[PDB]
Amino acid sequence: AVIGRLIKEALPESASVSKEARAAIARAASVFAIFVTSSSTALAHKQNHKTITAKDILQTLTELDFESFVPSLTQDLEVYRKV
Amino acid sequence: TGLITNEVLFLMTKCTELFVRHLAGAAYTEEFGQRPGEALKYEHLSQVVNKNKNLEFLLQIVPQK
């Protein structure tokens, strides 16, 4: 899919990914979204909010050990809100 | 449960693709470090998923064959 480029974008020059590796990465990314959604719900639930917010997901991300993610997503939200 | 905002559809899409890059990269880096031009296989993905603790939710999705 578009996962093919995202992958070969994250990998060094001339690297290759077998069709099983990509498939696996695809399933992995799918469980990730469901998992982060699920967890954001819980955090949004413990944080009182009736609705999941941009900060409920960014907090879940970091609470789920993917704090690296946050800085860009915040840089993106900031640019996303202006447009 | 409330509704799902665009800002969220957006943020969710944005971080999933960061995770695709993360899992791929992490899997390669843990196998071939920085060495370029290597071939990534399923073993490498199930290897980091069995290593990195922040990836334990994927133990059943990316098991070790």
Curated annotation (Swiss-Prot), chain A:
GO terms for biological process: cellular response to gamma radiation; CENP-A containing chromatin assembly; chromatin remodeling; DNA damage response; DNA-templated DNA replication; heterochromatin formation; leading strand elongation. The keyword Nucleus applies. Keywords: Nucleus. GO terms for cellular component: ATAC complex; CHRAC; epsilon DNA polymerase complex. It is found in: Nucleus. GO terms for molecular function: chromatin DNA binding; protein heterodimerization activity. It comes from the Eukaryota. Accessory component of the DNA polymerase epsilon complex. Participates in DNA repair and in chromosomal DNA replication. Histone-like protein which promotes nucleosome sliding of ATP-dependent nucleosome remodeling complexes. Part of the chromatin-accessibility complex (CHRAC) which uses energy/ATP to increase the general accessibility of DNA in chromatin. As a heterodimer with Chrac-16, binds DNA and facilitates nucleosome sliding by Acf. Has a role in DNA damage response by preventing cid mislocalization to chromatin. Homodimer. Component of the DNA polymerase epsilon complex consisting of four subunits: the catalytic subunit PolE1/DNApol-epsilon255 and the accessory subunits PolE2/DNApol-epsilon58, Chrac-14/DNApolE3 and PolE4. Component of the chromatin accessibility complex (CHRAC), composed of Chrac-14, Chrac-16, Acf and Iswi. Forms an heterodimer with Chrac-16. The Chrac-14/Chrac-16 heterodimer interacts with Acf (via N-terminus). Interacts directly with Iswi and this interaction is further stabilized by association with Chrac-16. This is DNA polymerase epsilon subunit 3. It comes from Drosophila melanogaster. The lineage of its organism: Eukaryota, Metazoa, Ecdysozoa, Arthropoda, Hexapoda.
UniProtKB/Swiss-Prot annotation, chain B:
It comes from the Eukaryota. GO terms for molecular function: molecular adaptor activity; nucleic acid binding; protein heterodimerization activity. One of its GO terms (biological process) is DNA-templated DNA replication. It is found in: Nucleus. The keyword Nucleus applies. Histone-like protein which promotes nucleosome sliding of ATP-dependent nucleosome remodeling complexes. Part of the chromatin-accessibility complex (CHRAC) which uses energy/ATP to increase the general accessibility of DNA in chromatin. As a heterodimer with Chrac-14, binds DNA and facilitates nucleosome sliding by Acf. As part of the CHRAC complex, required for oogenesis. Component of the chromatin accessibility complex (CHRAC), composed of Chrac-14, Chrac-16, Acf and Iswi. Forms a heterodimer with Chrac-14. The Chrac-14/Chrac-16 heterodimer interacts with Acf (via N-terminus). Stabilizes the interaction between Chrac-14 and Iswi. This is Chromatin accessibility complex 16kD protein. The chain holds residues 35 to 99 of 140 of the full protein.
